[PDB]
Amino acid sequence: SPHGELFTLVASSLFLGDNGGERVERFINLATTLSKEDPEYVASLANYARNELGLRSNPAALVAHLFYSNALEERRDLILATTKKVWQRGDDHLETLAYVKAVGWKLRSALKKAIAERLNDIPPSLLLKYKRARRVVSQRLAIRLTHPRPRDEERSLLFQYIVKGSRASEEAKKLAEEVMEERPTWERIISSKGSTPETWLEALPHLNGLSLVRNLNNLFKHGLLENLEVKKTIEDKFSRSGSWKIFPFQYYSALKMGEKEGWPYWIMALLEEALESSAPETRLEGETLFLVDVSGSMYYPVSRNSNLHMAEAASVLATVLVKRLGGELWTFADEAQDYTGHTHLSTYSLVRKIVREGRGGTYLERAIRKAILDRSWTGRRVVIITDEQTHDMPWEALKDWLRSGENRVAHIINVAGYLPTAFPEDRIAKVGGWSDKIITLIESLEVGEEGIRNFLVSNYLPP
């Protein structure tokens, strides 16, 4: 299936880096074939990948392929809608330009015009925040290649500043430091004035959502969490936490740091409440059995910057999803342990308990027999999160359970990358690593190569 192959090639870049040998040449071939044969699918995939998977290079390349296909002339409105969905950040159109360069194509008029219109339309402060002045494909290069006719006086001056910087008129240099002086981000208050109780007090009104959550320790170390006006302001902000774009693991990461540092209980309680409320909406239906690897090897950091280890990340995900879908929550190492009787604890407390009670070796097949096979579990979906190494003839007990009922499916997420990302094969889908975007991936993989086309177009065709 070329539709399915292109999907998993794109999705796998979540684990093989956003960004050549086989995967480049196969990507080019599949994207060319599908932009000719099913441009709606290509456009929906680029939207999905940009905005559900958070990927940047693959969707920008898919946009390039649409511009160089029959869809340019036959479906210009689709191409415009797609660029509206894919060119989100100030440098995304630069990624499309970069791909066109990488593959050897001549930059064509329609793409030039689209980039030029984008150069005229991006908010000025965002166009300067993503100058990309030291990249090869910079905003300077884009302006010189696409020749935007400045719509506005300010835009003429922004172009001047971008293309020559120092050598620009002070008429333009001033406006450069003005789109940065007004409406300044909190990062600016702190970088310019430094890091003091008064500078963080000034930053706080501009601290919202994830930026607030991630900067609570800076507030704490300056004593600001004992300031009563700070408390009132953070309570006001957290009263709208339901509207934040934030994953459950980011609340858990904040709480864990609050444990280490001794944050006051009032802020911990706010974070615990926000974590408890953080179940995402999913297309998945039906009770689900989660089987979470908590062997010692899972106690490795998720990444260099994260304060989480893998067992924590996997447990956070499984706990939030099982509270949304219903079903069962098991972990496993030497033995399987059933936590379903404990889902009434807060998510924070349950995950802390799980990870505290984990560690050991990795006996996945034994766990599947205890948890799924011998108990004759009756739900239709199993999700296993593991770092087990590649065994030959793997999950035969799982296949046994999958054949013992109608429409059963399993997803195996291997956080060490020891599996590919694959649509269900013998009713087992596979995910090639860890990602905070696993839910939308499972959703897509569950519809199979037979449903992915209409699934992606009906859900994600650019409007």
Ligand SMILES: [Ca+2]
């Ligand atoms: Ca393991």
